Amino acid sequence: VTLCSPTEDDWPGMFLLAAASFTDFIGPESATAWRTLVPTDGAVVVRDGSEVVGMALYMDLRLTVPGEVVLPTAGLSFVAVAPTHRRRGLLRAMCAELHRRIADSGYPVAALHASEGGIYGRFGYGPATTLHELTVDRRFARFHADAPGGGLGGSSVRLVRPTEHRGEFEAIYERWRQQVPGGLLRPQVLWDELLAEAKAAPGGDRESFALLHPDGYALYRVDRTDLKLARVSELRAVTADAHCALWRALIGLDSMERISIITHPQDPLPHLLTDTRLARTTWRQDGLWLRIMNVPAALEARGYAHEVGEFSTVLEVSDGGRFALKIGDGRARCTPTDAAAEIEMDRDVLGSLYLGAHRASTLAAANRLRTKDSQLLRRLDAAFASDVPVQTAFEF
Amino acid sequence: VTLCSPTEDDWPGMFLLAAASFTDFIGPESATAWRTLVPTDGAVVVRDGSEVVGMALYMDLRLTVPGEVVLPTAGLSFVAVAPTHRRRGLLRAMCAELHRRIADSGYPVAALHASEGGIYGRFGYGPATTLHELTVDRRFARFHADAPGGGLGGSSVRLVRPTEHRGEFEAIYERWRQQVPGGLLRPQVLWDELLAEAKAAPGGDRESFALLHPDGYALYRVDRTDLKLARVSELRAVTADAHCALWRALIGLDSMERISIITHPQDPLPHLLTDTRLARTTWRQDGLWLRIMNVPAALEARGYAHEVGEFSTVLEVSDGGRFALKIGDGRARCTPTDAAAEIEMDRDVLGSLYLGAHRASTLAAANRLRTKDSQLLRRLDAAFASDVPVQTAFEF
Amino acid sequence: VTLCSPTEDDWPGMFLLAAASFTDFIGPESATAWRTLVPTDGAVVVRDGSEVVGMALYMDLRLTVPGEVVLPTAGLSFVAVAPTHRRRGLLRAMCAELHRRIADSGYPVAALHASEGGIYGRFGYGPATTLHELTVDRRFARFHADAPGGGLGGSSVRLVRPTEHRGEFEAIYERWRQQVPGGLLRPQVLWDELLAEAKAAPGGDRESFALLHPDGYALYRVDRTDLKLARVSELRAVTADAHCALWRALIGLDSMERISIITHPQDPLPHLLTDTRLARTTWRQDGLWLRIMNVPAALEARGYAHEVGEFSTVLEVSDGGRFALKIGDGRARCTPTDAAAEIEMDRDVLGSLYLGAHRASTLAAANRLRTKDSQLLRRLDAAFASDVPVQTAFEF
Amino acid sequence: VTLCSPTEDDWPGMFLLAAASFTDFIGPESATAWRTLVPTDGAVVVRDGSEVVGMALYMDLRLTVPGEVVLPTAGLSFVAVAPTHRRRGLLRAMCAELHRRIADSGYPVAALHASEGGIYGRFGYGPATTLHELTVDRRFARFHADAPGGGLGGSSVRLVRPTEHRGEFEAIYERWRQQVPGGLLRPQVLWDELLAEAKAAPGGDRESFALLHPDGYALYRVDRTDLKLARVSELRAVTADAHCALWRALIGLDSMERISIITHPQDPLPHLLTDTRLARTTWRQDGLWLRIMNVPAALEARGYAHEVGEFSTVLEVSDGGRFALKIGDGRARCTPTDAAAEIEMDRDVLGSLYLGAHRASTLAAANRLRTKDSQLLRRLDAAFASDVPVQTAFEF
Ligand SMILES: NCc1cccc(OCc2ccc(Cl)cc2)c1
Ligand SMILES: NCc1cccc(OCc2ccc(Cl)cc2)c1
Ligand SMILES: NCc1cccc(OCc2ccc(Cl)cc2)c1
Numbered sequence A, B, C, D: 001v002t003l004c005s006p007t008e009d010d011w012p013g014m015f016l017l018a019a020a021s022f023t024d025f026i027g028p029e030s031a032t033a034w035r036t037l038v039p040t041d042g043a044v045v046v047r048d049g050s051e052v053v054g055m056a057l058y059m060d061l062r063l064t065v066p067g068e069v070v071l072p073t074a075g076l077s078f079v080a081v082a083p084t085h086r087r088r089g090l091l092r093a094m095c096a097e098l099h100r101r102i103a104d105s106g107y108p109v110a111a112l113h114a115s116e117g118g119i120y121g122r123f124g125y126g127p128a129t130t131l132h133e134l135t136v137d138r139r140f141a142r143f144h145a146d147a148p149g150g151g152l153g154g155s156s157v158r159l160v161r162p163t164e165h166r167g168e169f170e171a172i173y174e175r176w177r178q179q180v181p182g183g184l185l186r187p188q189v190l191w192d193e194l195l196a197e198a199k200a201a202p203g204g205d206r207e208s209f210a211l212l213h214p215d216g217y218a219l220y221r222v223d224r225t226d227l228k229l230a231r232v233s234e235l236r237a238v239t240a241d242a243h244c245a246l247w248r249a250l251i252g253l254d255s256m257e258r259i260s261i262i263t264h265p266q267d268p269l270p271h272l273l274t275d276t277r278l279a280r281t282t283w284r285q286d287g288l289w290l291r292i293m294n295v296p297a298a299l300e301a302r303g304y305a306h307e308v309g310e311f312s313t314v315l316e317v318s319d320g321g322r323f324a325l326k327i328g329d330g331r332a333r334c335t336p337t338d339a340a341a342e343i344e345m346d347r348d349v350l351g352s353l354y355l356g357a358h359r360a361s362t363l364a365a366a367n368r369l370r371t372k373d374s375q376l377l378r379r380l381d382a383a384f385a386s387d388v389p390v391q392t393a394f395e396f
C-alpha cells in the first residue's frame, strides 16, 4: 500500500471507486467539472500494488465567517476506501497527508460534509452548521397581518425558467454568500452544473422552476414520487422583503399540499404565518464540518459580538497549542503562552464554536469544553455568537 | 348565552363537555384533583339558557423566569366550546372575562399549552418554550472519551419503583424548577397524579420505572405498541454529572432499539456521544405559551444578561402602553413615557421573547418586531437571552 | 459486587429487575409457579452492596435427544443485568458460577432460549433447533389427492374449550415429547400456566380454542389486531394422520385469510397442498441453544444413524478435552486420548450438531469445524443426523 | 385450434403474447439470443384459426446432478396461454406434445422455473431446489475468530467492472457449475445477456459492480428505490476461502445498511458471523422444478451416498413403470420388474427427491411417498442425500 498524488491514468480507477462508493455519484462528466477546483497536489490515492483502493482530495473554496470575513478554505471531498480494504488505516493515512499539505499551503481552515456523524470528530472536524428541514402544509398557511408585502398591486416576484436568468441568480447569490456566515463562493463551473440539474431527466427528477425577485430567488421542483410535494432546492434572499415575497409565491403553488426546504434553525418563515406550527421541523442534521488548521489565524480572522466587554483568557486546544486570547471591540488577539489554561477543548469543539452554531455552555455541559469559571463561559458564548445566523451554502 | 362563574351543579355538565372535547381527558377523579389549584372565581362557563356550551379556567402556578425569579402565573386550562356553538365568539368572551379577573387579581403573566398553533396569538399569547423530541438508536450509541462518569466502580444510578421514592423525586424536582426558566412548582396533588399514572393499566400504558441519582431522575416506560421503544416521560437533572449518569443508564436498556424523550433544543445529550447524529430530532413544537398581563411588572421582574452594557430605549406594545426601558447590570427599569417609540411589537411577541426561546432578530426579520436601529436589535437579543436554557416543566 | 445464592427477601428485588428487563415478563404470580422448577442452589444474584443488579438461574428439565433418550437438562432462564451495571462482567461471572454448580450436580447438558444471537456463543451454547414460521393463505389452500383423511363421513377432529380437556392434552403431549428430539417434559405447574393464558384478557389476547384428535391437538387464537389471522400457538401430532386431520380443520377456519404457526423446517404441511408455495416461510430463527457440559456423557447418551458403517476418529473440543470417538450400530463410545486430533471445534459447535439441526459439512465450510479428511465429514454428517426431525418444545 | 411447430412469421405474434404474459419480458432482442438454445422442433404454438393464442418451447441445457454427473436437460420456457383462451386445455396439450418430443429425442430429464406453485405438479414436475433469501444488517456484522482470511496484509478480492473481466467470470462459473448439483452450463449468448444487464438503465437498474477472487466472484447492484440495500444477483465460490473473502468485502460496503442474496438453505454465511441471527431468512421459494422423463436412465445416472450399505427395493412411479432398484457403493441399478412394489410415488415426487433438496421421510409423512417399511425410508433418505448441497444456477 503506497500513498501518492494521483496521475492522469488513475482517474478512471478513481471514477470506478467513486461509482461504487457514492450512490449519489455525480458521474465522470460532472466529476471532471468539480475537478477544475482541485489544486495541483490537492489529491491523494492509495494503490494496492495496480489498482486504486483509497482516494481523497480538497478543493480551493472561499468561506464567509462572522464579520463578513472570507477565508481561503480547503474543502475535502471524493473521500473513499474500497470495501476490500476496510480497517487498514487508509482514511487516517490519507487525512494526515492532506492535512499536512493543507497546513503547509497556508489554509487557516478545512471543511467537509460528512457521510456519517461518527468518522470526522477524531481528525479534528466539528459540525459547524445545522440543516433544518421545514415542511409547510400550504393548504392552511395564512400570512400574519404584520408580514411584509401584503399590499395590493403587482407582485415583485416572477416565475421563470432557471437557464434564461443565469446572470440574475449569480449576482443575487454573490451578494448572499458575502453577507452570511457559511456562505461559499460559487464558481462558474458549479453554476454550469446547477443549471444542468434543473432540466427534467427521463425516469428521474422533474423540471425545476424559479421564483425571481430583485433581491432573492427560490429554485423548486415537484418531488418525483409524491406529486403533492414541492421541494425548494435553494432559496437565497438578501432582504427580509425578498424572503417574505418568495414565500408568498411558494404558498401560491395551489397544486401542492406541502412545500419542503432544507434551511437553518433561525429561518423566520414560521413567524410569517398566523399558525407558526404549520412550518413543521421534519429533519435536523449537521451540515458543514470545520477543522481549524491554524488556531491563532482562525481566531483573529473572524469578528466577535460588540455587546460583550473586553476580556482575556488562556485557551488550550488539546493538540493545537496554548494561547492568550483577548477579545474586545469585536476583535480577537491570540498569542502563544505557557501560562495556566483557563479553558481546554479538542480541536473539533473549536470548529463547532467557530461559526456560532453551537454554544460554549452546551458543549461545557457535555464536558467537551472544560473551565472552572462560569462567567468566562457566559463571555465565550456571547463573544462567539453570530449576529447574522449561520446558513449552509451547498454540499461538496 | 350568559357568562357566569360555575356553580357546584355545573361540574357534571363541565365534565361532559370535557369528555367530548379532550380525547386525553384525565377523568372526573383526576379533574377533581387539579381543580384544588383553581381559585375561587378562577372559572367561567357559558350556559345556552340549561346546559354548559363553553368553559375556561385558570390555576394558581409559580413560573421560574431568567435570573431564578419565581412569578405568580395564571395557568389557563380546561378551555372548551361545544361543537354545537362554534363561530359564536364564546372563546373570545371567556378569554376577555378571565384576563380581566387575572389582571385585577395582580398576576403579571398568564400561561397555557395550545391544542392548535393558530388560536391564542390573537389574545396576546406567544409561544415561549420549544419541545424537541430526540430519538437515540441506542444500539450504536457510544459515549465520548470526554463524557463524565466513564470511570470503573459502582454506578451512582439505581433502577427503582417510582412510588417507593416519592420524597427523593419531590426534592430533586423542587431544586430543578427553581434553577431553570420554564420551571413550574409541582404541588402534592400533581405528585399524587404523576405516581398514579406510573402503574400499568389493563389494555393501556405499561409500568413506569425510574432511574435515580442523588442529583437527578428519569421516569420511563416501554411504548404500548412499539416494544423496542422506551419513552422517557421526564428527566430532571440538577448537575451535568447527573444528566450524563442517567443517559448512560438509559443507553444500558439493552432490550430496546430506541430511547425517545421530549426535551429542549439545548439538551447536551448529542455531545455526550461519539456520533452526535445518533440523537435524532424526530419532532419540534411550541410548548408553554405566555401572555404578559403587566408589561412593566414582567420586564422589571426577570434578570437580564450582564454581558451587554447599559442601554435605554422606548418600547411600545400594540395595546399595552409605551415605556422607557433601561437595561443595565442584569436589571431593567420600565416606566411610562409619551416619547417616540424606537421598538414596536404586539403583546404575543413580548411573551415569545420573555424566557429567551426566540431571538428579537428572528422576530424582526418576520416584521413581528419593528425598529430602524440594528444596534438596538443586537442589544435586545443579547439582553433577553437566558444563560440557563429554557425548559418546559409539565403540561396543564 | 458480591455473587451469592438469593434469599427470600431478594425475590421482590429480582421481580423488579425482571419487570424492567423482560417486556414479556410473565408477572410475580406466574414467576412463583415456574420457580417450583428451580432447585435449591439453582439461582445466583449480584448485589451492588443493598439491591439486585444481576440475576440468573436454571430449572430442572428433561430433554429428549435422538434415539428417544431423555437427559436431565439445566434450563437457564430469568437472566438479567441492570441497565446501571452493563460492561462490568456480571453475565460472565453469573454464567461461570451456574456452569460450575450445573457440572458438579451431574447435568450432562444445559439449555436456553437467547434474547439475542450474539451473547451465548462465547459461554459454549450453540443454536440446536430452528423455529420456522409458516403462513398459509387458506383461501387458496386445497389438499392433494394423496393427503390422508380425504374420505367422506364424520371428522375425527373436535373443536373444544382447552380448559375442559386438560387430561387429553397432557397425555398427547407426553407421547409427543418422548418421541421427538427437542421434546421437554411439561410439569403440572406449566399446564396450569398454559391453560390460564388460553382465557381472553381485557385489552389483550382473544380466547384460545382447541382442535382435538385422539393422536394430536392444535391450540389457536385470532390475532389481537389482524382479525383475518389465526395464530396456532402449539400443534402436537403423534401420527401423520393426526397432523393432516388437524390441518384440514385449521384450513376450515373460513373467517380467516391466513393461518400462521411457528414449526420446524421439516414440517410436511406444504406437501399436503396442491400448491406447496401457499405454505410461505415468513420468519426463521434459532430456537433452543445447548451447552454440552460433559462431552463423553452427552456423546454416549444419544443414538446415531444405523445407515453409516462403524468408524473411529479423535475429536478435540477447544476447552473440553480430546476423545477417541467410535460410532457403530447407532451407538458411540467416547474415551480419553492424547492421540493426534482428526476433528477440532469449540464447545458451542458440538451443541449445534448434537440434535441434528446443523450439518458438520455446513459448519466445516465456515471453518467452525476443522478436519483435513472430507470422508470423515460425510461420516459425521450422516451419523449425527436425526431420523425424527428436531422440534422446539416451549420457551423458558 | 391447431398445435404446430412455429414458422418464422409466427415469432412477432409469439413476442406479442410474451410481452402481454411476462411483465419481466426480456424484449425481442434478448428473446432472439435465448432462442439460439432452442433446437429445431423445440417449440409449439396454438393458432386460433390467424393468431397465436398459445406457445411453449424447451432449450438444450446441461444440468449437474449429485456425483458431478452432467445430464442433457430439456429446459421448458416461454410458456403462455392468451387471456382470451383460458380453461380450453391449451397448456395440457402443449406440455403433452413437448414431453413426447423431449422423450423421443432422448432427454432423461426436463426442467423449468414455475410462475405459480400449483400448475406443474400434475404434468410430473416436482420442485427440486430451494431459493433462500438472506438479508444481513451489515452495520452489526462481525466475523467469528474462526472465519477464514482474518489475517493482516493485502485483500485477495478486487472491486472491478464486470465487462472488463468476462474471461475470469466465465472460467470461475464453469468450475462452479461442474461441481455443484443444480449447476447449469452457461453458453456465450447468456454471458452476452448477463454483461449487458450490468450497465445502468435510465429510470431502471443502477450499475452492477463485481468483487473478484481467483476462486470466486459476486455481482451486486444498489437497489433502485431502497438506496441502503445492496442486492447480490450472483455469488459463485469454488472454495470456502473465496466465499468468506467475498462476504468480508460485501460487509465492507459501509454506505449500505443491508446486503441481500438469493442463495440455498445450506449457505454457511450465518456461521461466519459472531451473531448467526444477523443473516435473516427474508424469503423462501421453490427454484428449479424437474420432470424425470426416463426413470431408469435418471436413477442410474446420478451418484448416491457411500455411507449407506447395499440395499434392494421395488419402486413404482404412478405412470412411469415398476423397477427393481439396487443401490450400493454410491451407484444404482434400476431394471424392469412385475414383483410387488415396496415404494410408490407420483413422478413429481421423484423429481423433488432427485437432487437431494427434499427428504423421502418428509414426503412420506405427507403420504406423497408410500411404504410400510420405515427402515427402507431411512435408507432412501440417506442414499438420495447430496454430499454437495443443491444450488440454483440461473432462471430460464
Ligand atoms: N454528496 C453529493 C455531492 C454533491 C456535490 C458535489 C459532490 O462531489 C464533489 C466532487 C466530485 C469530484 C471531484 Cl474530482 C471533486 C469534487 C458530491
Ligand atoms: N392536555 C392533557 C392534560 C394534562 C394535564 C392536565 C390537564 O388538565 C388540567 C386540568 C383539568 C381539570 C381542571 Cl378542573 C383543571 C385543570 C390536561
Ligand atoms: N421469554 C418469555 C418466557 C416464557 C416462558 C417462561 C419464561 O420465564 C421462565 C421463568 C420465570 C421465572 C422464574 Cl423464577 C423461572 C423461570 C419466560
Ligand SMILES: NCc1cccc(OCc2ccc(Cl)cc2)c1
Pocket: D024, D026, D030, D031, D032, D034, D035, D038, D077, D078, D395, D396
Ligand atoms: N422469468 C424471467 C426470465 C429470465 C431469463 C430468461 C427468460 O426467458 C428465456 C427465453 C426467452 C425467449 C425464448 Cl425464445 C427462449 C427462452 C425469462
